[PDB]
Amino acid sequence: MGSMERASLIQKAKLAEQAERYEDMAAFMKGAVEKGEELSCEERNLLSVAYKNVVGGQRAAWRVLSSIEQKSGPEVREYREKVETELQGVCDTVLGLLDSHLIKEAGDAESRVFYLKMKGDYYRYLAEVATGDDKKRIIDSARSAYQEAMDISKKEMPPTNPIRLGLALNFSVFHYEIANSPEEAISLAKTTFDEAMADLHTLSEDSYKDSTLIMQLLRDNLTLWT
């Protein structure tokens, strides 16, 4: 990767996306990050889509195997452990990139909130498979990342901003699914939805489709949870 120019790495990520080759896409984006320049919004999208496709596949697989393991010799456990280790690997790579290159005290609020959201998400994916004292530490790491992101977003972004919304949606999922905190999940989602709708008239047209998508998901989870 490091022998390729940054512009070629970005181009090859876009090609890999067109080819539905998400592992390659992610490796290309990791090489691009390693060049040491900030990512644009478009580039953050490429990074996010790539690694979420990869981990998404691993999560679906882990869930299938875990279900079988719970219903049902040594093979299922062995194979679930193999998939789990691979998932933890990808999560560690992402968290590594966030810590070593992407998260900074400087730069605009959008970027800072995005990367802290991402940090929360990938710790959350680690928490889905963790059991130990390890699980407790992992959960605290997810909570800490999400909370920092929430604090910045409340200070620096409008309530209907799609990054702020996606962060809040994901933190609400954390509360419900990871932290055994349904009251806080529902309260955060309801507050988020209402505050977003109260300021929707100020939102730029370029964000409207995205913000309405996330507010629909807040509504749907609220229906599910209540």
């Binding site: 889509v49 496709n53 949606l169 994901n170 995205d210 998508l213 998901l217 989870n221």
Partner: peptide
């Protein structure tokens, strides 16, 4: 049914 998180789409 699991809760839905932010979808993996280009924003």
């Amino acid at each position: 049914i699991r809760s839905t998180s932010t979808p993996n789409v280009h924003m």
